[PDB]
Each structure stands twice: as C-alpha cells, then as structure tokens.
Amino acid sequence: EYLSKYAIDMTEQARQGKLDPVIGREEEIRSTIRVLARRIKSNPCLIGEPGIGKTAIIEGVAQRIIDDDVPTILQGAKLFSLDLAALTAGAKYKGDFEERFKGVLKEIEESKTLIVLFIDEIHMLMGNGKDDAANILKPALSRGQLKVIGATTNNEYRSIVEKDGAFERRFQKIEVAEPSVRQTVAILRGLQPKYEIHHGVRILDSALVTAAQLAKRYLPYRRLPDSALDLVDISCAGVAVARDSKQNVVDSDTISETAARLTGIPVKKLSESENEKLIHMERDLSSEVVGQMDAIKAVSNAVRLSRSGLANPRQPASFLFLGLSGSGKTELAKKVAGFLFNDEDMMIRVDCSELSEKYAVSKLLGTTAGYVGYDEGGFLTNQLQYKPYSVLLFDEVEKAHPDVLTVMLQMLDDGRITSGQGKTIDCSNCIVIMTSNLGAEFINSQQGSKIQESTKNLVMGAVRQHFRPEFLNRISSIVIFNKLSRKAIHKIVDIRLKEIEERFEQNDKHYKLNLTQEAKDFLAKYGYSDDMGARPLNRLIQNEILNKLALRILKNEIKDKETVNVVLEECLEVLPNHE
Amino acid sequence: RIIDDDVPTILQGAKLFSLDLAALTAGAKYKGDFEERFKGVLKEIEESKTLIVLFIDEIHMLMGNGKDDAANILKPALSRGQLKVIGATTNNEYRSIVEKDGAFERRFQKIEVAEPSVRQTVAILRGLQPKYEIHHGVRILDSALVTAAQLAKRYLPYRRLPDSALDLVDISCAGVAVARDSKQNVVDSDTISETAARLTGIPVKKLSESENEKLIHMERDLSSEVVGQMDAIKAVSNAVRLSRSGLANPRQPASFLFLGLSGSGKTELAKKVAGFLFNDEDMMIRVDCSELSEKYAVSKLLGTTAGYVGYDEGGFLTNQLQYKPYS
Ligand SMILES: Nc1ncnc2c1ncn2[C@@H]1O[C@H](COP(=O)(O)OP(=O)(O)OP(O)(O)=S)[C@@H](O)[C@H]1O
Ligand SMILES: Nc1ncnc2c1ncn2[C@@H]1O[C@H](COP(=O)(O)OP(=O)(O)OP(O)(O)=S)[C@@H](O)[C@H]1O
Ligand SMILES: Nc1ncnc2c1ncn2[C@@H]1O[C@H](COP(=O)(O)OP(=O)(O)OP(O)(O)=S)[C@@H](O)[C@H]1O
C-alpha cells in the first residue's frame, strides 16, 4: 500500500471529524463531483490564486463523501492528499521515485473501491522535459479511472499547460475564487469557533464583518479567505495576549489597531479624540501657513472626508496647488503629512522636471516586460507597496510631460494604479498633491492679497492652457496660494524665527527675537519678493541671522537671549554677541 | 529505572539486552543461518524467564541490505507475541526505515527525543561531573560545567549539547590530567574557554593576556603597511576589538563595506587584516564576486541539492566556513 506511505487519508480524517466546516463552496464541490462522476475525463482542478479555499473544497468533499452526499459513483469512494515525498523519497538511484508513482497508481487502480487522489500542487510535478519527469508518468492512465482532483494557481496552471499541452486536454478546470464580503463573513463565522477555542477568546460577529470588509478595502495582495482570516487570527492572538495578561476580538479596536500596526493608513485607525483631531490641524498648519487658510481648509476638508468613511473608496483625495511662486505650498504638503501620520517625511515625491515622453511613464511606474531594468514601480509604485497611504507629491507638475501627467489621472480617480510589469497597486486612502506656479500671474494683480472672484478664473484659464480638463475636473480641489503681502510676512518672519528656535539644535541659548521694524523690514524688504515668496524669508533668516549667530555660538560668544537688528542692501542684519 | 523499580511491574520484571551485529555475523557460510541466529533469540525472549526486551540501538541497520528476506521478516512474523523491542534511529534514518520497510512504521511508536537547553545540559553535566573528576583525578568548577554547556552552544554548532558540553568537560579534564601526568582542576576560563578555542579556533575565547599584541599592534601594523585610510583601519580594529571575549553579538560576523577610490587599499586592507588575524594574508577566503549571475551566483557559493550534476557543494563559502569558524 504505497499510497499509505505518502498520502494523507482525507477521508479518514473526515470520518474522525477534525476538519473545519466548509462554507459557501457547495457549488465548487458540486462541480468537482460532477466531473468525478464522468465516464472518462474525471479529473477536475481547483484553480485560482492562493488563499481562496482550494483545499477547503477538498475537506468539504471529503465530508460529503463520509456522509454519502455524493453520486452513486462516489458512494464509498475515498480520498488521498499525495504529492510530497512521492517525488523526493527516491533521492538516490535512477527510477526510484518513478517506481513509487507507478506503484501508487497501481494501488489506486486495482479493486479497492474508488480512490481519488488530491494533488495539492500539480505544478510541482510539472513534466520537467517530459521524458519520465514526474507529471509525464500520469497521462497514459488519465482515462483509467485513477480519478484525481488537482489544484494550482492560474500562473502555475498556465505555466504547466503551456509547457505541457496535454494536461489542458485531460483536466477540467473549476474556477475557485475569493467570496463576496458577506460570503467571507460567513466563512469567518464558520471558522470563528476554531479560533475562539485555540486562543480562548471570543470573536464579535461584527469583528468578523469588519475583518471581511476591511480585507476587501485594506489588503489588495491577499485574497479574502486568508486576508480576512488573518485579520481575525492576528487579532485573536492579540486578544489572547490581553486575555493572558488580564476577552474578545473587538470589531473596532482590536481589528483597527491590528490593521494600523500591519500597514498603517490613518483612516483605518481613526482616533476617537474628535474635539481636537481634524480641528487642531488647521491651527497647526496656520502657524506654518500664515494667511493662506484657504489651502489649509481645502486640505483639511479632504482629510475629514477620509476619516469616518465619507470619501469614496476609489477616489484618493487630491489637490492641485496653484499659486504665487514661493507661496510655501510644498511645505504645506509636508505639514499635512505631519498631521496625517505624525510624520512630515512620510511622503513620496517626484521631480517633474525630469519627465519626458521618451521615458517618464516608466520612470514613474517602471519599465515593462522585456526591457532593461526591473525597478518595478519606478519612482512611485516602488514605494506605494510599502506605504499605500503616503502622501504623493509632484514637484512642479506643470513641467511634467503631458503623457505622464495624464497617467497621474489614476491618482486622482478610479485608483487602479498599475505597475509596468502588468501588476496592480490600487490606491484609496492616499492624499495626492501636484504643484504649479500658474496662479502667480493673477495673484500678482495684487487686488487684495487674497485672490478674488474672476481673477481665480483667470488662474483656471492659465491652468487649462497647461493641464488638460480631463485632469482638472477630477481634482478634489484646486487650491490657489495667495499673496502673503506685508502682514503675513511680518507674521511669517516672527513665526519662522520662533519655529527655528524650537528646532535650532537645543534650547541652550534662547532668543529674544526683538526684530523691531529694522529686522522685520530687512527680512520683508530684501527677502519677500512676490515671485520668491516666503522662500527668501527663510533663506535670509538662515543665511544672515542663524548663520551669523551660529558663528558667534561656535566662538562661544553667545550664552543667552539672542537678538536681531540691522546696519543702517548693506543692512545684512549683522548681529551682536550675547555672552 | 528498572532495577530501581520506577517502572510498572508489568514491565519492571523484564530484562533488557543489547543485540545485533555478532547476533548475525557470527554465521556466514550456510544459507539461513541468519534466521537461525535470530530464531532462538526470538524464542528464549519469551520462554518462562520473564519477558526480555531487545534493544536494537540501530533499527535502521535491520530491514535488509537489498531486503533479501535477511531474517528481518522474523520480526513482523513473530511480532504479535509481544517480543517487545525498543530501538532507536536518527531523524534522517527514521525516514529511511519507514520508506524501506513500511511495517516498521506500523509496528513502532515513533518518539521524538529533544535536545536539552543549556540549562538542562548543565544539569546533565553536573550529574556526570563526579564521573569525570574520578576518572581523571581532577576537580571541576561548577562554573566550568556551565561554561562548557554555554560555550558549546555558541561555538560547537555542529554537535548537539548532550555531547558537545561533555566533550568540552572530558577533553578539558584530560588536558589537566595530561599536562599534570606528562614528563588541579578544570577552570571555566583558563581551562575550558581556552580548550574550546584550541579545538575549534576562536581567538577571542583564548582570553589572551594582551590586547596590545593583538589589537594595538593591529592598528599600528595595518597603519604601517596601509597608508592613509586610518579611519578604516580603526573601524576594523574596533569591530574586531568587540569580538574579544565574545562580547560582540553571537549572531553577527564583524562586517564591513569598503567604498572608496580604487587603488586606496579596498582589498589590500582586507589582506592585511588576514595578515594580522592568521598571521598570514593568504588565509583570507576570497570570494570571486566578480563572476555573478542569479542563476549561478548562489550555487557556486553554497552548491546544490541531490539530483544535480555534482554535489561537492560549497565552492567558496560552505566548504571553507565548515572548517574555518573565524575566517
Ligand atoms: N471552510 C474552510 N475550511 C478550511 N480552511 C479554510 C476554510 N475557509 C478558509 N480557510 C482557510 O484557508 C486555508 C486553507 O485554504 P486555502 O484557501 O486553499 O489555502 P490554500 O491556498 O489551499 O493552501 P495552499 O496549500 O497554499 S493552496 C485554511 O488553513 C484556512 O485558514
Ligand atoms: N502660505 C504658506 N503655506 C505654507 N508654507 C508657508 C506659507 N507661507 C510661508 N510659508 C513658509 O515658507 C516656507 C516653505 O517654502 P517652500 O514650500 O520650499 O517654497 P515653495 O513655494 O513650496 O516652492 P515651490 O513650491 O517649488 S514654488 C516654509 O518655511 C513655510 O513656513
Ligand atoms: N594606502 C596604501 N598604502 C600602501 N600601499 C597601497 C595603499 N593603497 C593601495 N596600495 C597598493 O595598491 C594596491 C591597492 O590594491 P587594492 O586594495 O585592490 O586596490 P583596490 O582599490 O582594491 O582595487 P579595487 O579594484 O577597488 S579591489 C595594492 O596592490 C597595494 O600595493
């Protein structure tokens, strides 16, 4: 009985129970059975992607077999899971494993009721150059009963039959696929007592639902049975630790924290501190963003939609930041990331001046099949696979070549971002920002520092001249970055010096910062041009103030309360010591 | 446990015998003598004088070399009559037993036997401590036993603890007696740490008397020959310094990546390091990374599995590291 030395008697296990319940797979089972009930080519296959119930089906049919819920032909049949050592026990001496394979088929073929094999991984037999290379040992007898149910993913399947050509003329593919979200829940429910027993915890029914929905909207690279079950099992393990520490899987908190840990995506965590969350961010940003509350609100609005689920699952929120050059809109994208992730450097960004029709799409998403370089994902999906929710930033997107600009439509809506190798990324809870200086021409009208009605349409005009309407009409919001003028820049300067103090290495020296009109004007006069915007306010602060005082610090001429003043372009700040 | 009566009386009344080998090889000429040799054993085993349990320490040496009905058939054939047999086999051998016979899997109860932890190992060593002290006429420090088990776990990965720890104890005890009785006790450090190093290599466990003539001179001499790159020399010397006494992480090789202008000594330093470490530059294991393809790149270093043209695995790494632990 060679079979008993290599295979697992699934029937015996089923006879003894020790199997999971099988949920919703009745039709895959019916099809499997129907093929097995055939006169000749009774060789069905369970085919799809990993983690979709392919072996569940077998436990299922094993149970149907035990209970005679099968056709006459199968009523008394038995089933064995083989593979494994059948191909490797014969580690030495030519023809040894071949003899086993044959002996097994002989054992199966003769007399002993109807025996059905289950091949878990038919691709492992493959037919490695045929010429007696394992899989090739079968075909001679595929008509001679020796019924067998196979299993393989579509990639594996396609590889086998393309290279072989006979198996696809001998076997009956049965599509096996992930369940709907509700069906997934039913599955999770069926396995619920298994996990509850092994971990000693309860699972809320709503946790099963959350895991099913979450998996569908969280893990694009894992099929629902495994994906949702892992969310359940991983969560159960976490709960078991809590149980042991001194419980159940909490739909909201166990699963959300587990998910937050596993991947991130702020939306899946959603903090309960509503009094401040999604409120305070505008104030935090206001300090960074002086005057331009309009941009803050535009962003904050999208952030608020993603939280609590108002945002559309397939529409990553996205903005186009138009405006006065030097407006500070890039830092805004980082400061938003600051709030969103408690990480200003979470983002992925692309320098769009590097883009050309000759290569840009591949620089962004990676090259395709047969071409040099497999840096799949290029600048972008290469990184999305690690941080699906990171903020995306397109520096000077206005300079991006129009073809790659068009590819970026995927970020804006119908979020099926793909990779050059024919793979799918899928973005949802991912805020995307693109930048342009087109609004500068209208902001520079100076008709109030705030861009006004009508003039903002002139901006849209400039935008239509550079961006296709196909892009523009799909942006969550197009935001215009206004003139800061003297009032904002006086505040920006006071603020920049403050914010620098807080981050100026250590608070050992401290500042007075009494700029007085002299230094406020220096920074606001020889700095903030409308076309340089705030860029020079920071540069003068660093080039003249932080630098000269730093040099005095290095000489140990400064001990306490540093001040700022000017010579009176010769002003150049030029600050005294503070020893 | 039987003579001490820690065994159910059902079994306690039994006698235990170590069999095989001569049991078969005593005969030769005369076909069937082999069966005649197993046959009266397999009768006397139950003939009034209690039940005798046979011990086949190496079950895997039964079954038959090409089967040949080499009296192995007597076992299954008679196995219904108790005739209890206890045996043993290596994990690897068990696989062979099962595949070769089948019936043995059905007749025997497989039992996994665990490797002890260092803590458990030391307890074992303590039990045997007096045997070695008596056998050699030397004493053993308790910390020495701890050291042997702990040290072995870290520096004898090819040998399981029940043996590795004892090898260090027995070898060390002999080292003490041997030196003594040439033309005392086993010291955790001065005897075992040093003994293991003499056996396995690992200079850091020699607990050398001088980090001047091992580290200091290293920086000087590497600097004497390699001019400039002082930064690198110190980086290596310091990384090496951390391995002293085993302070460095038990799972991480000293490791460097040398970047820089060609002609700056990126490999010359490495040779000089070997020049210091083994007192010989040629003891460095050069890995020809210049020739790599993902389809050969690993295999030439680590070799391949059975069934592939040529086994002689390990071209550059396995074949050297198995013999040179601190290369
Ligand atoms: N009704 C079910 N019965 C048993 N297992 C289930 C069931 N539903 C989901 N599963 C999970 O799926 C696993 C086995 O089912 P599959 O999705 O076929 O996994 P698989 O991909 O067949 O396994 P391989 O060997 O990688 S194909 C189990 O270990 C469970 O975690
Ligand atoms: N309205 C604003 N929004 C954001 N940051 C601002 C604003 N006004 C001033 N800043 C400050 O200006 C600096 C950020 O400037 P950057 O974003 O590098 O310049 P930029 O205008 O983004 O350059 P671009 O976007 O390529 S034209 C920070 O120090 C901000 O605190
Ligand atoms: N700092 C140095 N002091 C003394 N001799 C040196 C020094 N650097 C290099 N040399 C000599 O020049 C060669 C340096 O050899 P290598 O270290 O291989 O050069 P390299 O940079 O390794 O070459 P590659 O291609 O990067 S391996 C040796 O043959 C030494 O004789």
UniProtKB/Swiss-Prot annotation, chain A:
UniProt similarity note: Belongs to the ClpA/ClpB family.
Modified residues (Phosphoserine): 42, 142
Localization terms from the record: Cytoplasm; Nucleus
Induction: By heat stress dependent on the heat shock transcription factor HSF1 and the general stress transcription factors MSN2 and MSN4. Expressed at a higher level in respiring cells than in fermenting cells. Expressed in stationary phase cells and spores (at protein level).
Annotated region described as NBD2, given as residue ranges: 250-440
Full-sequence range covered: 165 to 884 of 908
Documented effect of changing residue 121 to Q: In HSP104(TRAP); completely abolishes ATP hydrolysis, but does not affect nucleotide binding, thus keeping HSP104 in an ATP-bound state
Mutation effect (residue 329 to T): Impairs oligomerization at low protein concentrations. Reduces ATP hydrolysis rate. Unable to confer thermotolerance. Completely abolishes ATPase activity
Subunit structure: Homohexamer, forming a ring with a central pore. The hexamer is stabilized by high protein concentrations and by ADP or ATP. Oligomerization influences ATP hydrolysis activity at NBD2. Interacts with YDJ1. Interacts (via C-terminal DDLD tetrapeptide) with CNS1, CPR7 and STI1 (via TPR repeats); under respiratory growth conditions.
Gene: HSP104
GO molecular-function terms, A-Z: ADP binding; ATP binding; ATP hydrolysis activity; identical protein binding; protein-folding chaperone binding; unfolded protein binding
Cross-link for Glycyl lysine isopeptide (Lys-Gly) (interchain with G-Cter in ubiquitin), residue positions: 329
Effect listed in the UniProt record for changing residue 413 to N: Impairs prion propagation, but does not affect thermotolerance
GO cellular component, one term: TRC complex
Binding site for ATP 1: 48-55
Protein name: Heat shock protein 104
Motif, Nuclear localization signal: chain positions: 482-498
Major subcellular location class: cytoplasm
Note: Present with 32800 molecules/cell in log phase SD medium.
Domain text: Has 2 AAA ATPase type nucleotide-binding domains (NBDs) per monomer, a low-affinity, high-turnover site (NBD1) and a high-affinity site (NBD2) with a 300-fold slower rate of hydrolysis. There is allosteric regulation between the 2 sites. ATP binding to NBD1 triggers binding of polypeptides and stimulates ATP hydrolysis at NBD2. Nucleotide binding to NBD2 is crucial for oligomerization. The C-terminal extension is involved in oligomerization.
Effect of residue 371 to A/K: Abolishes the ability to refold aggregated protein in vitro and to provide thermotolerance in vivo
Organism lineage: Eukaryota, Fungi, Dikarya, Ascomycota, Saccharomycotina
Annotated spans, NBD1: 3-246
